[PDB]
Design a protein around this motif. Structure first.
Motif, PDB file in Angstrom:
ATOM      1  N   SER A 106      29.760  35.691   1.812  1.00 44.95           N
ATOM      2  CA  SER A 106      28.631  36.474   0.838  1.00 44.95           C
ATOM      3  C   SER A 106      27.391  35.988   0.757  1.00 44.95           C
ATOM      4  O   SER A 106      26.745  36.702   0.609  1.00 44.95           O
ATOM      5  CB  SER A 106      29.700  36.278  -0.429  1.00 44.95           C
ATOM      6  OG  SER A 106      30.820  36.668  -0.417  1.00 44.95           O
ATOM      7  N   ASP A 107      27.218  34.566   0.785  1.00 46.13           N
ATOM      8  CA  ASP A 107      25.759  34.240   0.818  1.00 46.13           C
ATOM      9  C   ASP A 107      24.947  34.328   2.213  1.00 46.13           C
ATOM     10  O   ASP A 107      23.815  34.371   1.948  1.00 46.13           O
ATOM     11  CB  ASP A 107      26.035  32.646   0.270  1.00 46.13           C
ATOM     12  CG  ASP A 107      25.689  31.727   1.334  1.00 46.13           C
ATOM     13  OD1 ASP A 107      24.589  31.724   1.923  1.00 46.13           O
ATOM     14  OD2 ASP A 107      26.607  31.081   1.608  1.00 46.13           O
TER      15      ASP A 107
ATOM     16  N   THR B 115      25.392  36.517   4.616  1.00 46.31           N
ATOM     17  CA  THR B 115      25.180  37.870   4.745  1.00 46.31           C
ATOM     18  C   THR B 115      24.049  38.444   3.860  1.00 46.31           C
ATOM     19  O   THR B 115      23.374  39.209   3.999  1.00 46.31           O
ATOM     20  CB  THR B 115      26.118  38.841   4.492  1.00 46.31           C
ATOM     21  OG1 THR B 115      27.140  38.513   3.546  1.00 46.31           O
ATOM     22  CG2 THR B 115      27.184  38.809   6.085  1.00 46.31           C
ATOM     23  N   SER B 116      23.957  37.846   2.812  1.00 45.15           N
ATOM     24  CA  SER B 116      22.942  38.051   1.594  1.00 45.15           C
ATOM     25  C   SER B 116      21.534  37.579   1.883  1.00 45.15           C
ATOM     26  O   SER B 116      20.665  37.818   1.705  1.00 45.15           O
ATOM     27  CB  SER B 116      23.454  37.312   0.278  1.00 45.15           C
ATOM     28  OG  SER B 116      22.926  35.920   0.323  1.00 45.15           O
ATOM     29  N   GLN B 117      21.585  36.280   2.717  1.00 45.90           N
ATOM     30  CA  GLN B 117      20.387  35.578   3.010  1.00 45.90           C
ATOM     31  C   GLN B 117      20.019  36.542   4.180  1.00 45.90           C
ATOM     32  O   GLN B 117      18.898  36.585   4.510  1.00 45.90           O
ATOM     33  CB  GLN B 117      20.708  34.276   4.044  1.00 45.90           C
ATOM     34  CG  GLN B 117      21.187  33.106   3.173  1.00 45.90           C
ATOM     35  CD  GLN B 117      21.133  31.919   3.740  1.00 45.90           C
ATOM     36  OE1 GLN B 117      19.949  31.451   3.969  1.00 45.90           O
ATOM     37  NE2 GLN B 117      22.315  31.117   3.979  1.00 45.90           N
TER      38      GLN B 117
ATOM     39  N   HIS C 107      20.965  40.129   4.401  1.00 50.12           N
ATOM     40  CA  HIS C 107      20.528  41.542   4.170  1.00 50.12           C
ATOM     41  C   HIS C 107      20.337  42.436   5.130  1.00 50.12           C
ATOM     42  O   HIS C 107      19.175  42.870   5.540  1.00 50.12           O
ATOM     43  CB  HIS C 107      19.333  41.452   3.126  1.00 50.12           C
ATOM     44  CG  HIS C 107      19.037  42.624   2.522  1.00 50.12           C
ATOM     45  ND1 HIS C 107      17.773  42.432   1.650  1.00 50.12           N
ATOM     46  CD2 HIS C 107      19.433  43.934   2.453  1.00 50.12           C
ATOM     47  CE1 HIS C 107      17.731  43.706   1.244  1.00 50.12           C
ATOM     48  NE2 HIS C 107      18.791  44.663   1.811  1.00 50.12           N
TER      49      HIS C 107
ATOM     50  N   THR D  38      19.272  45.349   7.635  1.00 48.93           N
ATOM     51  CA  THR D  38      18.807  46.685   7.496  1.00 48.93           C
ATOM     52  C   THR D  38      18.422  46.967   8.930  1.00 48.93           C
ATOM     53  O   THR D  38      18.354  46.100   9.862  1.00 48.93           O
ATOM     54  CB  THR D  38      17.468  46.875   6.520  1.00 48.93           C
ATOM     55  OG1 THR D  38      16.384  46.086   7.469  1.00 48.93           O
ATOM     56  CG2 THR D  38      17.836  45.997   5.267  1.00 48.93           C
TER      57      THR D  38
ATOM     58  N   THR E 256      15.808  44.716  10.736  1.00 50.44           N
ATOM     59  CA  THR E 256      16.080  43.164  10.944  1.00 50.44           C
ATOM     60  C   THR E 256      15.955  42.935  12.431  1.00 50.44           C
ATOM     61  O   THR E 256      16.578  43.637  13.332  1.00 50.44           O
ATOM     62  CB  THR E 256      17.668  43.008  10.506  1.00 50.44           C
ATOM     63  OG1 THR E 256      17.669  43.121   9.070  1.00 50.44           O
ATOM     64  CG2 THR E 256      17.691  41.377  10.717  1.00 50.44           C
TER      65      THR E 256
ATOM     66  N   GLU F 160      29.957  45.646   6.526  1.00 52.19           N
ATOM     67  CA  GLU F 160      28.896  45.676   5.384  1.00 52.19           C
ATOM     68  C   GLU F 160      27.780  46.873   5.824  1.00 52.19           C
ATOM     69  O   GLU F 160      27.493  47.705   5.271  1.00 52.19           O
ATOM     70  CB  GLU F 160      28.200  44.611   5.051  1.00 52.19           C
ATOM     71  CG  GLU F 160      26.639  44.545   4.574  1.00 52.19           C
ATOM     72  CD  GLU F 160      26.018  43.469   4.259  1.00 52.19           C
ATOM     73  OE1 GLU F 160      24.872  43.327   3.944  1.00 52.19           O
ATOM     74  OE2 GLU F 160      26.935  42.354   4.488  1.00 52.19           O
ATOM     75  N   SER F 161      27.742  47.024   7.295  1.00 52.17           N
ATOM     76  CA  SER F 161      26.871  47.961   7.668  1.00 52.17           C
ATOM     77  C   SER F 161      27.392  49.221   7.445  1.00 52.17           C
ATOM     78  O   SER F 161      26.540  50.179   7.126  1.00 52.17           O
ATOM     79  CB  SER F 161      26.541  47.865   9.204  1.00 52.17           C
ATOM     80  OG  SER F 161      25.626  46.555   9.725  1.00 52.17           O
TER      81      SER F 161
ATOM     82  N   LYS G 171      27.047  50.594   4.122  1.00 49.80           N
ATOM     83  CA  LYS G 171      25.572  50.864   3.740  1.00 49.80           C
ATOM     84  C   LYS G 171      25.236  52.067   4.503  1.00 49.80           C
ATOM     85  O   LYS G 171      24.089  52.372   4.631  1.00 49.80           O
ATOM     86  CB  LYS G 171      24.630  49.935   3.793  1.00 49.80           C
ATOM     87  CG  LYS G 171      25.075  48.508   2.959  1.00 49.80           C
ATOM     88  CD  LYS G 171      23.873  47.612   2.935  1.00 49.80           C
ATOM     89  CE  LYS G 171      23.717  46.695   4.160  1.00 49.80           C
ATOM     90  NZ  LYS G 171      22.628  45.648   3.936  1.00 49.80           N
TER      91      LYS G 171
END
Length: 143
Positions: free
Chosen positions: A53-54, A56-58, A60, A62, A65, A100-101, A104
């Protein structure tokens, strides 16, 4: 290496997207290695269920990237060097990114994430893998 590993990465991600109910259209590879890796990844997600969780949050992720960002975050997994367990976490991490991709609505990225993983693999992990037995030792270790 290159060709082998790319096949190994695309198999794992396809396997993960399929299993989680998503599409896989966007896409030494012995079936033995592939099967062993699929299993190791399920085993892994069974225990540690956070889902990076952290990390992939670091990250993020898009469409803008760059590989360099992916590399910086993944290097975290290998702070104290490489080992079989972290290689599995690594595949597992790429898998969570793809999922996650897709959530989104950025299906386009899963093929890119596969490239990044293969590049990273060939670059930073192969050296250690070859020095400790190659994928055969992996197979012998994860039946």
């Amino acid at each position: 290496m290159s060709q082998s590993n790319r096949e190994l990465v695309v198999d794992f991600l396809s396997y993960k997207l399929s299993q989680k109910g998503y599409s896989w259209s966007q896409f030494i590879p012995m079936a033995a290695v592939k099967q062993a890796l699929r299993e190791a990844g399920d085993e892994w997600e069974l225990r540690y269920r956070r889902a990076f969780s952290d990390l992939t949050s670091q990250l993020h992720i898009t469409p803008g990237t760059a590989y360099q960002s992916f590399e910086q975050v993944v290097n975290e997994l290998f702070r104290d060097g490489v080992n079989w367990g972290r290689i599995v976490a690594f595949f597992s991490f790429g898998g969570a990114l793809c999922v996650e991709s897709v959530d989104k609505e950025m299906q386009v990225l899963v093929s890119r994430i596969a490239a990044w993983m293969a590049t990273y693999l060939n670059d930073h992990l192969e050296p250690w893998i070859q020095e400790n037995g190659g994928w055969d030792t992996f197979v012998e270790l994860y039946g």
